[PDB]
Amino acid sequence: YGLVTLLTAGGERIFSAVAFQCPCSAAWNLPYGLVFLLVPALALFLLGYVLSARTWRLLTGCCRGSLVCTQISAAAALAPLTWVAVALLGGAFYECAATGSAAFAQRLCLGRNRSCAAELPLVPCNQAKASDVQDLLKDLKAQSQVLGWILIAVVIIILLIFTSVTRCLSPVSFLQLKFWKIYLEQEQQILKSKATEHATELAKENIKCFFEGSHPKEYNTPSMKEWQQISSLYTFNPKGQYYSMLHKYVNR
Amino acid sequence: YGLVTLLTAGGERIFSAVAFQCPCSAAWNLPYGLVFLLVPALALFLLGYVLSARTWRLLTGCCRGSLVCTQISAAAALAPLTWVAVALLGGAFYECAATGSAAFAQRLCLGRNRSCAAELPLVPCNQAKASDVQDLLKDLKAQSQVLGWILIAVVIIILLIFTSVTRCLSPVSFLQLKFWKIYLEQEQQILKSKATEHATELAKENIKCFFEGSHPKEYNTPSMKEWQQISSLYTFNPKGQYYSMLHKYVNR
Amino acid sequence: YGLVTLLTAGGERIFSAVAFQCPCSAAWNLPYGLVFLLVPALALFLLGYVLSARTWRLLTGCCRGSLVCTQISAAAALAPLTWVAVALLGGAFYECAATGSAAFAQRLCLGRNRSCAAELPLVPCNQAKASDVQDLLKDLKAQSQVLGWILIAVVIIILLIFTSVTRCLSPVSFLQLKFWKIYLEQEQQILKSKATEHATELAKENIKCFFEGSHPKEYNTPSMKEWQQISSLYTFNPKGQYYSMLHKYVNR
Amino acid sequence: YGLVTLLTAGGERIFSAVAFQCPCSAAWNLPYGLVFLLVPALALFLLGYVLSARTWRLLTGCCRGSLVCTQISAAAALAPLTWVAVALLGGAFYECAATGSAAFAQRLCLGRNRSCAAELPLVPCNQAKASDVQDLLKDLKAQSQVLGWILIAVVIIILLIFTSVTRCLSPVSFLQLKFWKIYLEQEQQILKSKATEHATELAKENIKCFFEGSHPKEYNTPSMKEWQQISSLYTFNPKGQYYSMLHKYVNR
Amino acid sequence: YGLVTLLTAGGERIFSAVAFQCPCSAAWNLPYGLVFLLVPALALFLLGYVLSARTWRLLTGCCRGSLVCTQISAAAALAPLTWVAVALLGGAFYECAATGSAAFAQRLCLGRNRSCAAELPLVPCNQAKASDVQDLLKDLKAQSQVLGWILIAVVIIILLIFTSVTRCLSPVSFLQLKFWKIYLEQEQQILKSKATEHATELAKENIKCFFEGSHPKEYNTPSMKEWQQISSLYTFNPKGQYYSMLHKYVNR
Amino acid sequence: YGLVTLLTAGGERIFSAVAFQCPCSAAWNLPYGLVFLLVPALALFLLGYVLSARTWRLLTGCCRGSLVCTQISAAAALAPLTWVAVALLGGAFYECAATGSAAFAQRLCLGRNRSCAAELPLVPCNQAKASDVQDLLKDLKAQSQVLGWILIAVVIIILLIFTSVTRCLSPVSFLQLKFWKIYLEQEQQILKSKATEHATELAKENIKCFFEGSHPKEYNTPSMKEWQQISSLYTFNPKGQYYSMLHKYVNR
Amino acid sequence: YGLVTLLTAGGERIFSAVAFQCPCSAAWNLPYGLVFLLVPALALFLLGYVLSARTWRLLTGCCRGSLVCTQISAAAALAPLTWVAVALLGGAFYECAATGSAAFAQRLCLGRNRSCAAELPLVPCNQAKASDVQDLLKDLKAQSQVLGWILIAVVIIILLIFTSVTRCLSPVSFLQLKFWKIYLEQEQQILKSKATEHATELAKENIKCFFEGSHPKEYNTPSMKEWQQISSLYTFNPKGQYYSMLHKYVNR
Amino acid sequence: YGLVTLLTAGGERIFSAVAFQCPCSAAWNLPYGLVFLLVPALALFLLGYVLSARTWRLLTGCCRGSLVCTQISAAAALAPLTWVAVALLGGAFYECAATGSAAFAQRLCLGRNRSCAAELPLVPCNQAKASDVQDLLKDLKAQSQVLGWILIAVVIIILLIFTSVTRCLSPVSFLQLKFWKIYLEQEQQILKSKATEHATELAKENIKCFFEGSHPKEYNTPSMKEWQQISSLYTFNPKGQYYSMLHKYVNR
């Protein structure tokens, strides 16, 4: 129960701390909204850019490259766009971003109170009492939510076009591509299991030879150059089907 | 319990954020309603346009085509129409769409207050106090719900006509069409299972040959050109019944 | 629990949205009631017209016909009449339909307030304060419920006459008709099961021949023309009892 | 139940005691915030600097060294930065750090009340009633949260660059590095188990010889110089793959 | 349930009795705080100084000695420092220690009320009403908590330096030291078990000889001088590895 | 449930009866506090002096003796000191003991009201309204709690010195003393069991001889003089290790 | 549930009836307290004097005797003293016994109101309003509780001295006395069991002989004079150890 | 559940009906208390006088006799005395018996109001308002409870003397008397069982002979004169031990 209690206490403290006041300030407010917009989005973007093993496969070993790079970048930027869309649909962040540069304010307000730019930042702060801005905060909330929805539409549209073109111009058919992906999945799982047990037997043999203090068996050597040879990325040629470059490397 | 708590917290935050205020604004309100109408509808339409594997079957491989295209487009536009119908029956969105172009307003209001177009947008906002518009908001809600019901009738009618004609002019009978669909289902499931285990054995053999470092077996080759040959779409000719083009490709 | 919570939230939202206000409007109210009367009724009528496989049996294959058509139409119009009866017994819809054409109003009200047609639509809206109409709304509710009960009587009467005549003039006896229906039920279930397993074996054989890449077995061919031949509808002649046209087609 | 009750009582007492008042004091407040910033951060930094066995491996035995040292220092400073980021996002600590050196105050306040530096420390204390500082506390809270978010961005960026470069310039490939780490894991677990049972048998033999009072068996001797020889750190040379220096020491 | 009820009643009585009032007294208050500071700390220090069996091993038998003594003293003073740190972070004790010697008071208060030393002791007592001291109590609470945090930092720093130096200059490597500690653990457990059963058999034999009234067996004698010989402490020499002096005493 | 209900009722009655009012009386109050101090302490002291079987071993049989006597007296006075310490830390008892002899009062009060000794006993009674004594009761509570803490420190210190010296000057080593105590424990348990079954067989034989009415078996006689011989206390001589005097008595 | 309900109802009625009002009466109150003091104490004393089988062993058979008589009397008066101590610590009874003989009152009250003896009995009755006695009731409660505690100390002291002397001058040692008591326990249990089954077989034989109507077996006769012979009490002589007089009677 | 509900309803009705009002009446009240005193006591006395089978053993058969009669009468009057003691300790009954004969009243009241006998019966009725009797009711309650306690002491004393004398002058010893009572218990249980099965076999034989309609077996006859012979009561003579007169009747 200790873990449960500590986790609930930590979560409550965390959320009470992420309380979003949108401080009404003449000039220090814009960055307040801007960081709450960009930084968590950038964070999730980075985590996506990190997590996928496909890019790591390319990166290791002392560092056409455009296609794979834009593919991985989009496949990772999927999620941060979802976060920023959800936040922008939250409305609070952009509502705080209302002020921004003075150009936005001067172009923005209808000029009714003639005192917009002076103490506009008070408008999400609810401290200003001019009727014009008390209605204008609502319109700004609207612009935030609307922009968010427009973004979540643009992102799905881009995903459509991306996946469709990537699915349109490939030489291989569909019912084989599905089977190929199943193949790669099975290969990954089999590799995990058998490499695990092979490393296990290697360790067992070596540690027994250490306790005894004698020569090892010298059963076989997984060649490191071979490892690099099978780490190739592209895995296609119309003639030599040979998926999974390891499999391509069975002729010699 | 952590997943459960995080999911309920996220759902509550999400729904509190999708709170729909319908900001009363002279000109920025129309798009507010318009995005809440179109964008989620377009989203679900796109997801339908993506999900079905029948269209993907046509799309892959470097891209009569009308019939299949309108069939898939309608079969996917089924759901977005359901969303937009439910929303329009919600009444709030179109109620916010009341203003729209000025032509709608000038033609719309009875001319009683003579001040409609000035601050009509306040009518779902409940801030306007003219009796005429306080009753007119109700009629607009009515028009929304009624239009929604009319749409959900038109959509079912269209579905009827579509499925009836598609069921009327086909050469094959009913009790055979049912059996054929059962056939295709069984074929899909069998294909999934056996292709899975065949890829499994392929991977096993190749990974064993890799650990040993020797020549593979060369059992057999699923031909890629054969894969493309069996990916055909139409699957009918009165003479050569031969469902499931794979099955058609058993004579040679 | 996620499915349960989402379903209850959706149901609550749906029902809160189907809230029926009956907007009091001089001319736009009649259609408000009319759609809530007809459209859900038409919807359930259409779903009935779709669901029964007996009509589909007739429809497929490039399209005396009166008897079967009126039979299926009544057997499907059973349910929509139940919906419209329940709704009309609800009273709200027709109460909203009070206004209708002006002829209904002028003939309807006793002429007491002499101001009926002007703002009668307010009478279910409870905003009108003339004593005559405040009592007249009740009578309209009465007319709605009464008409509903009259309809639910007429529908059961029609069902009686229909099923009795259909049960009266048939040549076959009762205790055999029951057995015949049991027969058709058993035939349907047996057909489902055995056709399922036969398609299963067909698929197995063909997919094995594909993995191997060799000629199929050519066990037998369910003839498509035979399928159409056994799809006939009438299934009766006094001499050749031969229920279930498939069974009739065993002499040659 | 005694342990549970004592733990909940202790936790409640602990948290009630860590109550953070931010005493408003002219000069003794700055250190109040500074210790609550640095000391828990330094504590978690130290615990990280202690816990990892990789550094201990280097440290023991009477004490190129730069690379490993910066690697371990960053890998341990990961967590304290997370603590300080969470705290700075809490806002209270830095809000208490508002005062700091007088330079911060004189540069900070807009000069409105002209009495900032006199009793500014009261501003998180809520005792000062000047409007300027009552709004300025909010901006200070903002600066705290914003700086926190900037730090949590900088830390993830640094983690990215660190892990990417460390993953970029290594000679070995990826799919082999994963296998190598699995290898080291298996080696650690096998070592734990077998060393455990070997020490067990050693102890059993010696304690039996003690109860009897006779000469021991002298089965074998794990050489201490050998232990030191196998404690090496680098474990790489392009030619002699020989992971896990113990494994490198199997040729002689 | 009796034990449970008596324990909860005793705990409630105990805690209600340890209620800390900090009596405001001119001269008798300082010791009030001082005992609540030192005595529980000294108590836990003593319990640590008692509990560890390593020191007892040295102490028994009619009583270089510096190194082991400072090691055990620090290893035992670990916990009392934790208690005193937690208490000092509680703030109440030192807040009561505010008064102390008059030098602390005269140097302490800003000289505002000019009546500090007269009735300062009332300041945690909340009975004094001078504004200066009502704010000064807060600063004293601050000094308490801050000093506590400084102490909990100094203690962890000292622990770091201690364990690092003790881990730095030892001749044996790490991966062998871990194994050695595992060895000593296994030896302790084996000793417990086998000594237990050996004493059991000894007692059985002697008590049987008593019931019968005859001569004992005289199986063997665990020599007391041998016991003292195997009780040695240092257990290291670079040449004769021979951990666990018992094990060192197997050559003769 | 009857036992449970009677026990809870008895406990509630008991505790409601041990309600401590500290009657404010000029001369009869001192003994009121004194008995509540000494008598329960003396009671637990006596129970300790009774319970230990080591002293009984010395006492029986018609009654160097200093060492064992002070050892047992301290080992039994352990607990009463804990009771009196807990009570004195309760504060109420000594607070009632405030009055005591007049010397304590005259030396005690600052002489402010000049009416201390007259009606000081009212000070824990809360009936006196002089400000001096209303503050003095608090200081007396302080003196009680402080004295209690001083006592609980002195007792642990004495326990330390006692157990350390007793552990310091003994000739036998530690790791043998532990084994010896385990030995005595096992001997006690074995003695309990086997003496039990031997008395059981004795009783069985004699009662069978009684039912039959014949001569007994005369198997053996546990000699009473032997019993006294094996009841000796010291159990040590450097030469004849011979723990557990019974065991010492196996040579003849 | 009937037994449970009747028992709780009876207990509630019983306790509501034992409500102790201490009627304030000039002369009839003293006996009111005196009976509530003595009678339940005498009752429990008598029950103790009855229950122990050791005295019954002496009493039966037509009735040095001092030692056993004082031993049994003290061993039985143990409990009544506990009851009277608990009651006297309750305070109510003796508080009611305040009045007693007039000598107690005249010596008791300080002579302040000069009207003590007239209506002192009202003092626990709370009806008298003289300040002196309203404080004097408290002192009387004190005297009651204090006397109770003094008694519970005297009783434990007496128990100590009694059991110590009885344990001091006995000729037999301790470790044999424990074994002897275990012996007597086992003898009692064995006697219970075997006498039970022997009476069972006797009854079986006789009742079978009755149903048949024939001569009995005449197996054996437990001699009544033998029964009396084995009922002796002292069970000790230094020479003939022979515990449990039955066992002493095995020589002839 | 029906039995449970009916029992609780009956119990509630019964107890609500046994509500004891003690009607304040000048002359009809005395019997009100007297019946509530004697009648339930007499009832339980009678039930005791009935239940014991020892007296029935004497009574049957056409009706020294003093000793057994007083023994049974006391053994049965045990319980009614307990009831009357509990009731008298209840106080209400005797409080109602306050009035009694006028002699009790005239001797009873102090003569203060000079109006005792007129409307004294109102004193437990709480309707009289004279201070003297409002205090006198309390004293009467006291006399009731005290008399009850005196009675419960006298009864236990009498039980003591009775059982002691009956245990003192008997010729047989204790340890044989216990065995004898065990014997009689076993004899009763064996008699129950075997007589049961013997009557069972008798009935079986006779009812079989009835169904068949033939002569019975005539196995044996339990003689009625024998039954009377074995029903004797005294069961003792010093010479012929022969407990359980049935057992005495085994010589002839």
Author numbering:
A (entry chain A), B (entry chain B), C (entry chain C), D (entry chain K), E (entry chain J), F (entry chain I), ...: 20 to 82, 94 to 282
Question: What's the publication's text?
Answer:
In humans, the CALHM family encompasses six paralogs, some of which function as non-selective channels that are permeable to large substances such as ATP. We identified the three paralogs, CALHM2, 4 and 6, to be highly expressed in this organ. The CALHM subunits thus constitute unique modular building blocks that assemble with different stoichiometries into large membrane channels. In contrast to previously described CALHM structures, where the oligomeric state of individual channels was described as uniform, our data show heterogeneous populations with CALHM4 and CALHM6 assembling as decameric and undecameric channels with similar abundance and CALHM2 as predominantly undecameric proteins with a smaller population of dodecamers. Despite the unknown activating stimuli, our study has provided insight into gating transitions of CALHM channels by showing two conformations with either a cylindrical pore of uniform large dimeter within the membrane that is constricted at the intracellular side as in case of CALHM4 and a conical pore that continuously narrows from its extracellular entry towards the cytoplasm as in case of CALHM6.
As in case of CALHM4, data of CALHM6 shows a heterogeneous distribution of decameric and undecameric channels, but in this case with a prevalence of the former amounting to 60% of the classified particles. Both assemblies of CALHM6 contain subunits with equivalent conformations, which are better defined in the smaller oligomers. Unlike CALHM4, there is no dimerization of CALHM6 channels and the C-terminal region following the cytoplasmic helix CTH instead appears to engage in intramolecular interactions with the outside of the cytoplasmic rim for most of its length. Although the general organization of the CALHM6 channel closely resembles CALHM4, it shows a distinctly different state of the pore. Whereas in the cylindrical pore conformation of CALHM4, TM1 tightly interacts with TM3, which is a part of a densely packed outer rim of the pore consisting of TM2-4, the helix has dissociated from its interaction site and instead moved towards the symmetry axis to alter the pore geometry in the conical conformation of CALHM6. In a superposition of the subunits, similar conformations are observed for α-helices TM2 and 4 and the C-terminal helix CTH and larger differences in the interacting helices TM1 and 3. These differences are most pronounced for TM1, which in CALHM6 has detached from TM3 and moved by 60° towards the pore axis around a hinge located upstream of a conserved phenylalanine at the end of TM1. As a consequence of the disruption of its interaction with TM1, the intracellular halve of TM3 tilts away from the pore axis by 30° around a pivot located close to a conserved proline residue (P115 in CALHM4), which probably destabilizes the helix.
